[PDB]
Amino acid sequence: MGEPIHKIATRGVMLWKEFDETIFNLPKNKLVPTLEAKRDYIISRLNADFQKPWFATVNGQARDLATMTYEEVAKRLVELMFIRSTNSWFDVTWRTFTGDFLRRVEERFTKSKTLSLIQSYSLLDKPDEAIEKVFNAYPAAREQFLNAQDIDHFLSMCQNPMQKPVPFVPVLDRRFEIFFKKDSLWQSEHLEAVVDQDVQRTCILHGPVAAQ
Amino acid sequence: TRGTGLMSANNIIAEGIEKMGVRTFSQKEMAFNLLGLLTPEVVELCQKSPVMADLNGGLQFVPELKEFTAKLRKELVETSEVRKAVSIETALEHKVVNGNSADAAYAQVEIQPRANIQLDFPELKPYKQVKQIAPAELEGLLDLERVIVVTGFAEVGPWGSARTRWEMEAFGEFSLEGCVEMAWIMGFISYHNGNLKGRPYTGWVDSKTKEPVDDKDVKAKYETSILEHSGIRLIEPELFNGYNPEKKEMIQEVIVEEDLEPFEASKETAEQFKHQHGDKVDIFEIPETGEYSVKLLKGATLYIPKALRFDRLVAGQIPTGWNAKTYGISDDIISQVDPITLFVLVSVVEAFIASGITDPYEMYKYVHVSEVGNCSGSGMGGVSALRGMFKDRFKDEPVQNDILQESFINTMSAWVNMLLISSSGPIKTPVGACATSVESVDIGVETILSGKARICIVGGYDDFQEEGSFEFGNMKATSNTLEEFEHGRTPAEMSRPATTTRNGFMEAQGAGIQIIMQADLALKMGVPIYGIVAMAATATDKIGRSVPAPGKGILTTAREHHSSVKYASPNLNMKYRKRQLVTREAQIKDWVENELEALKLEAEEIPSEDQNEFLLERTREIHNEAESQLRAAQQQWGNDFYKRDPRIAPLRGALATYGLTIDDLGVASFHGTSTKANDKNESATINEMMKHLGRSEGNPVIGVFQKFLTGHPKGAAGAWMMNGALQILNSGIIPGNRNADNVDKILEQFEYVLYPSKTLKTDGVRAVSITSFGFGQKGGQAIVVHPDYLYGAITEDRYNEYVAKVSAREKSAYKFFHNGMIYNKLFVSKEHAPYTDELEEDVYLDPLARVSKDKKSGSLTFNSKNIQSKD
Amino acid sequence: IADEPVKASLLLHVLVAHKLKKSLDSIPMSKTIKDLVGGKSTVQNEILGDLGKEFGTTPEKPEETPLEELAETFQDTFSGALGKQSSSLLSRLISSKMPGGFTITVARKYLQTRWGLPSGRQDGVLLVALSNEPAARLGSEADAKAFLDSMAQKYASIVGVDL
Amino acid sequence: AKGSTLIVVPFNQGSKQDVEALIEFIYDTEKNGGLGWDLDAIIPFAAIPEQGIELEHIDSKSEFAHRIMLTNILRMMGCVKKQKSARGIETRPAQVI
Amino acid sequence: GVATSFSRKKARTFDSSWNWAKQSLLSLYFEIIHGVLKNVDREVVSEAINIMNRSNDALIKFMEYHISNTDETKGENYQLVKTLGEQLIENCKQVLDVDPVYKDVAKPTGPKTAIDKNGNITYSEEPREKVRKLSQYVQEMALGGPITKESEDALDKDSTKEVASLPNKSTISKTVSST
Ligand SMILES: NC(=O)c1ccc[n+]([C@@H]2O[C@H](COP(=O)([O-])OP(=O)(O)OC[C@H]3O[C@@H](n4cnc5c(N)ncnc54)[C@H](OP(=O)(O)O)[C@@H]3O)[C@@H](O)[C@H]2O)c1
């Protein structure tokens, strides 16, 4: 909303400041052109620095949702939303997101009316076995990029108001400020759910004078 | 007798009746017993005195049969209704006692299929599997710059695209993907993404009511409307500028007998009436307004409209709802061009997609702009524009000023260049009537072998309009629809090639396009390869005074000299040819050694500062002349061994190139118009080709008459046939002629032709022949060989590099296709050429200029540093 | 006026009502086909055949499903065009009941001129005309136009339109 | 099988005129646009289902079905006899099953 | 209901058995290779009868070419179509000049009405247990039953052997009429 905040000058906060001065201070008619021109730089910064990495990143390589397979997407959703240390989904609404996605994978790749292999999302509490089980029934989805109707569904699931915002940027568009700055405070108390567990990604509120 | 019209209602009690030791018969059993009465013994018995055959199974001995029937049916209904009521009550008792939480862990989730439309790129086998089918000697023997491959194809016709048409042709019903693709084409469904009645929806919606449509619900909701409005059907006036063949407008010239009541018309229009009529009209100024009073006098010519009933009411029209907008063409292009041009632009972008080329300018990474040809043509061109300028202009209607340029046959190919390709390649537009598309392939081949191009768009297109429809009826070429109705035939069954009763062709409309290129370039680019164009030939017939009469010219392609055939020629034997190539490869090596030695001797006399330049230039020249000599030998012993040999038919040698015999030409895609002269003459031509080339008795070619489904689209006919041939090659499925009720008894004399009525799923087709017989003696033939014959001519590494590049490009192609389908932007007109007007001359005049990715705009363009560069 | 395609709920009603030879109000939607027929499976199978012909597909248990739940199951896949059964029944109504000279197209004209009802709502009036089929052929043109008037008012009442 | 032939023809057994015309067509020469046959067997198995029609409910559909299943079988056998007798065919009776 | 339906112009002739014989054979050939028809299916024996009833010199040469070019080393299926093919070529040579024969080899069926636990009535045509040929059905019919009284084959095990037996007119030792 443009209200000033005192945060520790971590790498993620210094990226937040850079974007406040060169991307988010622009009028809406010049925002999308600047995001399309800076794309490659922006994604490199998000992946190195910020606490919400660029979602479409398959083993260091900066892709887009359009150029990711359905396996790639599923295994990225588990990598970002499921905490290996506690061996549980950081939020239940994230497990729902990942289940909804794995069911869409079945819908897209099945030839006839069948039973979902994910009967209850409670089965995703072993996510690597749930994924293998889905992408063994439908091995075509290991080698196909996302159908553009499934990109639009995935981004529509990312904007659901009745779930914890997704811990990543899925797209550079008109809504990039909302993706980048929404739900920015919990991370500092739960570094187990941050990318490298690196504090330097996160936003920690603190006073300049009381820091003495 | 169980399961008949009269006794199906009693089936449930039939098991009960059998418990009285009564026998109830199956229809088969009861027929068997009845056919026992027609045996000669019972017939001989019937001729003496009447015969009474009790085939009752003891039913007459059931006392009070209705009482027993009524009992058994009541007991069965009672048991049913009891068990249904007790089951419902026990399930409501178990639900109240344990609650609604008990049947929530027991309930399961149901997954409904979404339509996942595939581009059906050819399946690439492992290098071990493809190396078995080709002879071992083929590796290195072919020059791949001189092997033509089809890398992409598409059509717009009565059944939609090549994907939908193939489904209907081969299977006779649509899958989920087929239905959704037809529903999208015909504008029954659009894609919605965003808020829909508050709730956010991402999927298909009905296009009129904007109500959501699940992909499962598409077939139920639209199949009947999609079938009713596709393929051969009654001419729809909405599609043809209000043209109704029942009420066909002409004008009678009458002489005026009594002076018509004056009418008010402008001063210009009144002077134009006075110039025409002379003293038979009186124009007078009205001082009040300045308009003129035009009075026609006794004896003035006048024209009164009358309507004629025409007897051709059926045609293969593009599915109702088809709209170039749906594919992404803008309204400024649609207004400007003739609708045949729109079928072409869609077919061209759809063929680039099937090639996995989303951006045509990609081609300019690999070839010079002067190396991309457009060898495609039409039979009659833009007949909507002709009707504009001959008839609508005469009636002082509003017609655009450039309508002439839209009529030209060569104008569709121009709009493809001006909107998509922006090449400076060859542009040879054939006009072959019904053979155009095969004449297109032959020109596109000769262009790529002569080295003037490395890629041709080829194919054909034609439209259906009132005037053509009429003049094809006046020649009696087309089927009379009133006669077909008198004979019981529905529209669907009016196109029936090779049938006793065939009586003229069904007119259709549409376009078909193939992208052909050199194999050496297709392997480099990693485009899919659907087939090899082994041979393509045209032929006139002979002296005669009937332009529409088909003839036997194309028989020349099997011309072979059988005076001296005692001992097999070495030249046909691939080992011999490979041995002579290896012998010549050793000499080319010794020629490169001897030219490098001679360059070392010459470089000494050049000073030691200029030496680097001179050795670079002269080394490159040597490398060129070494490749030139290797490729010329490969051509001489691999590709062109049979051009000078009168003992090897052009048709035999095309197959022999890839180690196929004449017996390995499994399918013949016949022109098969459903005319009396065409279908006999075609069978007889194929039969005489195969007989002369010694095709093994008992191995007929399997005729394929695609025009039973599509109707004859004239220009486009062979383009469609080719697209079908490629779909047979890559699938192994040979579609049958579902209108071949009864094959014409005359065609039994041709032992080497089989005419199936149903789809055969073979174990593979190695080659397909396509024949066409246009008006004006245009015969034509093309052979197409399964692409897996090519992969035996390359090494494992080059194959595996290819397989990886095609996999990557098939994935990018699927991406581009689905994004374009849902956002109505498959077709994306180019704004600018790949060069600015300042570089135009510089790019044309450098044959090594290539496009590269411009870092700012992200779009392939020529950069001034890559033009007459050293690198 | 506003052109609407005939609802499946009216078509279904009229087809059942005509087959049982009862008025539309005499047939309640709540009841199932099996209840209405009254233990005569022949007539049940004749209705099922007529609906199967008219709508193309049927549900899995059309016998036990109530008429409002069949009308909703058909509307999901129903377009608005009459079909092969309605068209034939209307042709047999018009031929058998209208005076010699009055055809279907004259009825369609009269409804487009007198009332101003378009083709979509003409089809609806003709279906209401089928449901209340008179006993003997109408003697003159004037009582045939007076019948079409009474069916327009009935159609307007049931659908909820003002003429 | 080899030497077999199947002619399919539209036909309403209920119509007397269709019965007479179909038999004329089977017996008429190929010149006159018929088949030039001479039947060896007739198997008149047409029939419509009459169902839930008691004595009191006998009306049009029953009187019509009775025409199909009896009256026009007798008329068909009549027609075949009149066609054989006109050509003096006394030694090739047609078996009626 | 007395409306005329018949016109001479609407008659459809079907007489092209010479074409369909070859298509029938090619369909059977590929249905075996793809595994849609197996060596225990009565559909193979039915298609064999229907092909033999359309045997002529052209159909024999067609079989000779397709069967003699079949590689018996591509699979079990290719060996099976080669074996069945050579047997069908022999049968088609034997019955070249013989008249074609009506010969049903379909499994005879009886009525079965079942009501499940939920009360839904389902009628099927279930195969009979005593009667598995038509020869056995003619015997069952000859013996009659209690209400009427006053006062070796290779079917469903080896379709190839049953085919081999097709052209051989079995001599009936004693007729069913004696029993
Ligand atoms: N004065 C100060 O110094 C100070 C300091 C810190 C924060 N704050 C205030 O605190 C408020 C929130 O903090 P913020 O900075 O994190 O702003 P924010 O990003 O706008 O708020 C967090 C959002 O995350 C969503 N969310 C998170 N978990 C969720 C779950 N399990 N289910 C549903 N929704 C979930 C909520 O969406 P919905 O509301 O749409 O459900 C919520 O609006 C702000 O208004 C801010 O001004 C003030």
Ligand SMILES: *OP(=O)(O)OCC(C)(C)[C@@H](O)C(=O)NCCC(=O)NCCSC(=O)CC(C)=O
């Ligand atoms: O509505 P339903 O309960 O499913 O039908 C009940 C019955 C069977 C009673 C009904 O269809 C009906 O009334 N049918 C007519 C009686 C009947 O079945 N007659 C048979 C005519 S054929 C025949 O009789 C063949 C033969 C043995 O010669």
